[PDB]
Amino acid sequence: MLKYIIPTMMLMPLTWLSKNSMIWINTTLHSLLISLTSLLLLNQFGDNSLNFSLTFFSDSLSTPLLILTMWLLPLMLMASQHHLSKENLARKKLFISMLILLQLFLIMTFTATELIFFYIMFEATLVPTLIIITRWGNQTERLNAGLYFLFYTLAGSLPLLVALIYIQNTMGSLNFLILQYWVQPMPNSWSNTFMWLACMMAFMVKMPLYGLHLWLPKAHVEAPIAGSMVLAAILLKLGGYGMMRITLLLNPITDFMAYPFIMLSLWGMIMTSSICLRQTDLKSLIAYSSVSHMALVIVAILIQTPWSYMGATALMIAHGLTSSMLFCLANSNYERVHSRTMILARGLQTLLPLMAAWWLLASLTNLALPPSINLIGELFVVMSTFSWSNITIILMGLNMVITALYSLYMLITTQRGKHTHHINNILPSFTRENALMSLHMLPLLLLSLNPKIILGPLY
């Protein structure tokens, strides 16, 4: 994995030794080269994972998350270079250093063979994200946002640490490859009940679980654009990755420990999607849509069938691309009208038609239009939850109504109707902005041609 870790670290002298006019160009270029390099992780086998060393491995779960992570860094640099144009040069380099450091922590979060090293990289991701939100977020509430993001995580993750160390004392190892063969069944007891909660609640916070989700519509809203891109696209998926690894050790107790959380997710995706119908802040609407989409990934991981894991990893990759694009579109309107109020700037298709086409494609992927990988993940989770219980289709199908309703309402409010008369600073779309939208949307649509690389380890 060290052929990816070392160039990601070499981005640090690359950004700190660059000429002052070259720090976006150089980091964008070489992060795109690292992202091109990331496709060598697609040496996956039908039986074995790609096991590099004692410290690092990559199966078909971690590989698309790695490719998406390494792809998101150039797009974050493109998204962030405009609103940091007037910034001090050293603070600009510190911002890029926090993004590079976050990429470095993420790529060895997903490839960590041993679970306590997964824990340390998983929690190490908090510090650059907290710094990016509280230092380069725009408003006052970022400070409060930085507290919620910090303290819902750690209150969930410090019982995980203890739990993992307990497994270290019980199994003798936290190697996931060893734990594939030495896993013992976890019977019904109170000790194993709180073992289950300590193993699961940190990832439940990261997803987020409904009812634990309150950090997200502050953290993703108050963040700068690169912060929101990495929070929605990658850091939510640390929870899903960690659940898919940790539920190996939690059988068969999961078969009744999942029942409350499944309810919290199945009703929660009804709630948060409904919340999106009455959001006045566009970026808050995109955040609540992320909570609603990750509720399906929670249900799919908890019912733990092959179809549900395939749907959940497809939905994680698809939601990463779609939610990152939606935050970038909302930012492209924020960088013109300087307000996140969705009803403010209307009729934007009359003024910005190609950006309206990007809004259309991102809305269509948000509502899971076939054959997008959004629909592939959505549909496969719906198949597996119908097999779990046939009544879930009600809460599934009603969700797909509301998901359509808030996706097009967002599209109707901002793009359609009459333009606002008094707003006259709607600049034509920059090449950087359309480029950012296309670098989200074109890989997302090309993955429909060959979705087997985003279907995870039990494709």
């Binding site: 004692l54 410290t55 063979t113 936290l174």
Partner: protein, 57 residues
């Protein structure tokens, strides 16, 4: 015919010829506990290092 001892003579440590045996255990002590085994053998390196969670050295 008795000569008074000089200064220093009665404080001398003398030797005594006795027929009684030397007390082999005058403190009436019981058997002492056996000591712990000492360290012996060549010191080999630690197998696969520290084994602290994920460190290979």
């Amino acid at each position: 015919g008795w000569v008074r001892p000089d200064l220093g003579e009665l404080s001398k440590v003398t030797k005594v010829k006795t027929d009684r045996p030397l007390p082999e255990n005058p403190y009436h002590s019981r058997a002492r506990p056996e000591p712990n085994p000492e360290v012996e053998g060549d010191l080999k390196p630690a197998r696969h290092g520290s084994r602290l969670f994920f460190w290979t050295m």
